[PDB]
Amino acid sequence: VTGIYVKYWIYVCAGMFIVVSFAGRLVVYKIVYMFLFLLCLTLFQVYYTLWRKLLRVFWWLVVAYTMLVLIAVYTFQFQDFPTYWRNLTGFTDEQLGDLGLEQFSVSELFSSILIPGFFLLACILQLHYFHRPFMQLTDLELDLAASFSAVLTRIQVFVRRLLELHVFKLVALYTVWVALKEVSVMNLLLVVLWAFALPYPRFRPMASCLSTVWTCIIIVCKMLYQLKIVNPFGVRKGYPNLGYIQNHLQILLLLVFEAVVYRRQEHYRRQHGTRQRLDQDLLSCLKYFINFFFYKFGLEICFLMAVNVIGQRMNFMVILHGCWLVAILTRRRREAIARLWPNYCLFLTLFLLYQYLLCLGMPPALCIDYPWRWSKAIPMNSALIKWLYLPDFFRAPNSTNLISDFLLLLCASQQWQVFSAERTEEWQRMAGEPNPIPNFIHCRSYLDMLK
Amino acid sequence: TRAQLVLWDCLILYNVTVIISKNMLSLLSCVFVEQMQSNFCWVIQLFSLVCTVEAGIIWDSICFFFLLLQRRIFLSHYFLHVSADLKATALQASRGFALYNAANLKSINFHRQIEEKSLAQLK
């Protein structure tokens, strides 16, 4: 129980986030404070080394802000002092009255107490667990149960190793899903920029930090624009506003968590012929088969990704780049085709931007419909509009193009891995040849019979 | 291998070319239905077309995926064992011929021993 409690550190942060999120009606000031706290937490997480320098202080400050909010809630019950505050500040108390200077119902009182009470519980947990205990906590850890635990630890380690690829894939998946659900300024643009920064390795950590910052900015804008007041257009203002950026914010948080987990794994790592191995047994051949198969056959894999998306999407511009792909296949030389790919990568990126711009419609400058789109005797008709992508009174068509684009970008990244394939002498070393093969005329290896 | 791979590669070229061609027919069919419905009323008998506005080209696409896996296998040099097999074909028949005729001979020759055994009763 003591060990579990010591390891129960992130729970306080999760509870604070939960209190911040979906706290019934939003007490504008309280909601703003919660969002600011979340943003500060993200900034510290990026700062992590700096956050390590000032983490307990951050927790104490969060507790202090919660206490201040609760005290303010008590203060607004009195009426003379809020009037005094209005007089000194010069803004109306009508806004605060909308917020509610009065002690509201059992649900409201219970929620407010729980938020301050949750803050008190979190502060107590913070006092119980020192920053050094958290640093030690980063490391993690009848007979069958112990063996299972050891196997699980080995797995966890493998997951940490694969985390870089998994994280990139997850970030892309979240971006694509968000774009498919909704397309908005900076929303798709951030994903596109991230795709721009995926090829270069060194920018990629900074790019991740900046993508997280952009996601935070988008979430902040959504929170500010959670409702529409003026009613005098590129605005959500969803009444429930359950998850405008919640999926995106969660994805960013998961990525940061993966990064921190990677740091912990690296700290632990500080602590403490393959081909014939293939011939030996199931585990060896399978592990070799999986890693080698993907790193060498990523060209084939991308070919599959391209073919599947091309069939599923079925549009003309998508088909033309597919035609580029078949032109690529015409060449039978791996080296020459490889030389050709980087320019094709640039071409696919241009395709990504072009396709998104085509999806875009109703420019913010003009409220009424398009000039070029016509009910006149212009040669175009309903067939083009069904094929073309422009929101109107009638339709804004299918967004399968984005999922196909996702496949395209990931393939580009995999192509960069292929670039590492001709390079990376140590890894490629595993990958003349006719002389070894004859020996297994009918090799007795269990694997050999199947092969 | 060189000739077979190039010619077969052309076969794959045919496959992907068909991919592009059906995409073309499908897109044109979807965009315009009225003129095509009116004349392609008979052409629809010639060729059935696409939906009103499991689905998609799934069986062919997957055949393509497996086809891709196999061409790569073909490209590899693991065929040397196979190569023995192919050359091997050239010489079996004669031996099997003899084996076959010998078996018939053996059967007929074996047949004769039983009657001398019958003669053995006579003996």
Side-chain angles (χ1 to χ4, degrees), chain A residues 3 14-15 23-24 64 72 74-106 116-117 122 133 145-146 150 172 179 194-197 199-205 207 232 234 238 240 243 259 268 273-451, chain B residues 1-7 9-35 37-123:
Chain A
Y74 157 86
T75 61
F76 290 98
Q77 194 65 2
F78 297 98
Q79 318 157 8
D80 53 354
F81 288 92
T83 59
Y84 161 79
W85 273 75
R86 163 188 47 81
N87 294 340
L88 176 55
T89 57
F91 281 99
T92 77
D93 288 335
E94 170 282 334
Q95 318 166 6
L96 280 296
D98 294 335
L99 291 176
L101 275 72
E102 194 274 332
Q103 292 197 22
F104 284 94
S105 53
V106 54
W194 181 64
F196 181 76
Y200 290 163
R202 72 281 191 190
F203 312 114
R204 169 175 164 97
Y268 174 76
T274 67
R275 285 78 57 184
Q276 53 269 44
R277 163 195 273 192
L278 282 162
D279 297 330
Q280 293 177 335
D281 209 301
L282 309 183
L283 290 63
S284 67
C285 60
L286 272 299
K287 176 185 180 183
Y288 211 84
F289 193 42
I290 61 168
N291 55 352
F292 283 67
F293 193 111
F294 62 68
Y295 81 87
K296 290 291 289 184
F297 304 160
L299 317 172
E300 299 72 336
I301 297 169
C302 72
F303 295 157
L304 181 62
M305 296 299 102
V307 299
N308 72 51
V309 294
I310 62 170
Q312 78 86 27
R313 66 33 179 206
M314 292 177 72
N315 197 337
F316 294 121
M317 72 293 296
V318 185
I319 297 171
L320 67 85
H321 64 86
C323 295
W324 291 100
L325 270 287
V326 16
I328 297 171
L329 62 83
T330 78
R331 302 301 185 174
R332 294 334 300 174
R333 294 301 63 183
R334 183 202 312 180
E335 66 291 5
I337 299 178
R339 158 202 173 183
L340 272 290
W341 294 95
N343 66 44
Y344 197 55
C345 303
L346 164 57
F347 292 166
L348 61 87
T349 64
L350 272 290
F351 181 76
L352 294 174
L353 61 83
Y354 191 101
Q355 61 81 3
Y356 186 75
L357 272 285
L358 282 255
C359 314
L360 292 172
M362 298 314 194
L366 187 54
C367 192
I368 70 172
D369 317 302
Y370 312 106
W372 37 74
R373 304 294 80 90
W374 272 118
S375 293
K376 77 198 306 176
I378 182 170
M380 65 176 187
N381 64 6
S382 55
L384 181 52
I385 203 63
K386 293 179 179 179
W387 176 94
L388 194 44
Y389 206 112
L390 268 187
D392 273 315
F393 279 106
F394 167 56
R395 87 172 297 175
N398 193 334
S399 59
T400 180
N401 54 336
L402 309 87
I403 52 156
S404 48
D405 276 296
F406 189 110
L407 277 296
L408 187 154
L409 57 86
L410 67 87
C411 298
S413 72
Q414 301 310 355
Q415 179 56 256
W416 271 50
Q417 277 76 242
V418 166
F419 295 4
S420 303
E422 61 282 7
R423 298 287 72 78
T424 59
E425 172 284 330
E426 65 288 11
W427 310 71
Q428 66 183 177
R429 171 177 49 265
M430 295 300 101
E433 173 272 358
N435 317 120
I437 56 167
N439 59 337
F440 50 84
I441 306 91
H442 282 86
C443 182
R444 184 68 271 188
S445 171
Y446 170 100
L447 315 179
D448 179 79
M449 282 74 73
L450 62 84
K451 196 182 185 181
Chain B
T1 175
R2 186 295 179 178
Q4 64 182 359
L5 63 79
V6 189
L7 59 80
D9 289 331
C10 294
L11 294 173
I12 295 89
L13 291 172
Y14 175 75
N15 304 140
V16 291
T17 303
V18 180
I19 297 170
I20 298 169
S21 168
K22 339 184 336 337
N23 296 115
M24 295 299 102
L25 62 83
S26 70
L27 268 55
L28 61 83
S29 306
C30 184
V31 293
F32 293 103
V33 302
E34 65 277 16
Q35 300 180 355
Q37 177 180 358
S38 75
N39 189 349
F40 295 85
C41 295
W42 166 288
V43 178
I44 204 58
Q45 175 186 6
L46 302 171
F47 303 147
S48 280
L49 274 301
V50 304
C51 293
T52 301
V53 73
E54 183 189 352
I57 62 170
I58 56 171
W59 292 334
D60 54 68
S61 62
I62 202 71
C63 80
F64 295 157
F65 179 76
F66 288 97
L67 183 63
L68 301 178
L69 290 162
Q70 294 300 320
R71 83 291 186 278
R72 163 260 171 176
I73 298 305
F74 287 11
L75 291 174
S76 194
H77 321 91
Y78 309 155
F79 293 65
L80 182 155
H81 270 75
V82 174
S83 295
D85 304 316
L86 60 88
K87 67 92 175 180
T89 63
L91 72 165
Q92 58 255 17
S94 63
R95 300 66 180 168
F97 284 149
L99 294 174
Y100 181 32
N101 68 11
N104 290 22
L105 181 159
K106 271 44 166 189
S107 64
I108 202 181
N109 79 42
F110 182 98
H111 289 140
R112 77 184 74 108
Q113 288 89 2
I114 51 182
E115 64 277 14
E116 69 252 17
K117 311 301 176 300
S118 167
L119 288 174
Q121 292 79 17
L122 309 192
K123 190 269 204 161

